[PDB]
């Protein structure tokens, strides 16, 4: 089914403390796999998944160049946008760029995406047709026009539809064990007395991948108007993800309560109950 | 891989 190859680019201006910071990270699905950062003597693209640790110098030399090139263009763009907005050299500014291509279950291009953001708001967006843009303002309109005159959308569509997809395949293969051989949640329920008369049941879901997951509490196998705390899905550090969902319930009614866990790595949804 | 195509804004 749907896989994706995404890069996320960050350029931050550092007035008279060097040129701007540029960081680039590449994900397949929920798995970071490469990285570039211009804080070092040699800034080089580098692996950040064990399964890239065996890619040869042709890969790294090229992607190094590629990142460098983008960094340098992003310096230019930060200057340019300072201009369009008449801001001083003294201020620090952030330009961000996210792009990706997705596969369908057929193994083929499904959709592509590309967006720019100045100082944390949308600036310029590539439209779903990958043939045109959407500016948010006058400044962006100058950028729209420049891109139009340059057939940028064509060039990006070529990357997104073709090259992006070619390489997503290569990576999915190389990282099969991580990307395709999923990790179901290790799943359990803890009990935490609040007061004399009521407890928190908390349903854990640990070490799962990918990050998409659904935790649900049921009273007598049905919804409940009951306090339902749900924490943001969080990285364990090891490539997997964690999440819990708690409800507070009257002590001695913990058996009315069941946790429902849906995740792609399970063969089937699991239900769960506090075991004394 | 990275895009070989980088917009000039």
């Amino acid at each position: 089914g749907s896989h994706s190859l995404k890069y996320f680019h960050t350029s931050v201006s550092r007035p008279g403390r060097g040129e701007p910071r540029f960081i680039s990270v590449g994900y397949v699905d929920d798995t970071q796999f490469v990285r570039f950062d211009n804080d070092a003597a040699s800034p080089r693209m580098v692996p950040r998944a064990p399964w890239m640790e065996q890619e040869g110098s042709e890969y790294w030399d090229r992607e190094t160049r590629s990142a460098r090139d983008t960094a340098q263009i992003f310096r230019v763009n930060l200057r340019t946008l300072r201009g369009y907005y008449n801001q001083s050299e003294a201020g620090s500014h952030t330009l961000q760029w996210m792009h990706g291509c997705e596969l369908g279950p057929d193994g083929r291009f499904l959709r592509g995406y590309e967006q720019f953001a100045y100082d944390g708001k949308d600036y310029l967006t590539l439209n779903e047709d990958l043939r045109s843009w959407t500016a948010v303002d006058t400044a962006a309109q100058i950028s729209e026009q420049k891109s139009n005159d340059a057939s940028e959308a064509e060039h990006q569509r070529a990357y997104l539809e073709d090259t992006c997809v070619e390489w997503l395949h290569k990576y999915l293969e190389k990282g099969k064990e991580t990307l395709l051989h999923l990790e179901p949640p290790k799943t359990h329920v803890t009990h935490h007395p609040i007061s004399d008369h009521e407890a928190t049941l908390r349903c854990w879901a640990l070490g799962f991948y990918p990050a998409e997951i659904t935790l649900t509490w049921q009273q007598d196998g049905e919804g409940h108007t009951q306090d339902t705390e749900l924490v943001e899905t969080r990285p364990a550090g090891d490539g997997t993800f964690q999440k819990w969902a708690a409800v507070v319930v009257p002590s001695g009614e913990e058996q009315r309560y069941t946790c429902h866990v849906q995740h792609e790595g399970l063969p089937e949804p699991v239900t769960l109950r506090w075991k004394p | 891989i990275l895009s070989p195509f980088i917009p000039l804004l």
Partner: T-cell receptor
Amino acid sequence: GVTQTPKFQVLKTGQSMTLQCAQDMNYEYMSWYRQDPGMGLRLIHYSVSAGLTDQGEVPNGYNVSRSTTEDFPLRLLSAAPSQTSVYFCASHRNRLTEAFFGQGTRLTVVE
Amino acid sequence: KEVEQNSGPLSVPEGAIASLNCTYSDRGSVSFFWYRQYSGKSPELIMSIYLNGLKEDGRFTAQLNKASQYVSLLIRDSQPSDSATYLCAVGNHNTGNMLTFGGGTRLMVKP
């Protein structure tokens, strides 16, 4: 967009010479190709931006410098008959997009 | 030789379709160009293609097939103005040395 100079040039073996190139488009990338009659262009040297240069396919005999964005002169050190050729400067927005060339310099080096 | 064109020259009757081909060795090539050069003058960009497929502008059609590593140009209704050398250029992303040129094919439109 791209002003290259001069259009013609004769040189004595051993002389040195600097072809000029200037671009109003304010693009990062700039290049020097030579083209011998009947053949394709070959890349001599290029510059990714102000303050940088790289070698191309046939760098030998030639020096380049990129002080400004606007200009990118090519310098023949010690002219030889082999460097009798036509030289084109170009400007480019990205490394691998459209090369915009200049009018060209036709240059014969003679004993 | 990374970009192959046949020098020809090729003849086409005036009014007839001309067809010009180019192959290239590196699967890393991501951008493709047809340049027209009149004897004496600079290369001038006829057409640019990046996506696999067919692209049309006026009398010109270009076709790219990265699977088989060829790019081609078609000129409908050949005119004496179309007589020239035609240059194939690819942008190789594996090597990054700007645009890499084939040797060119000269087209003689005979009336």
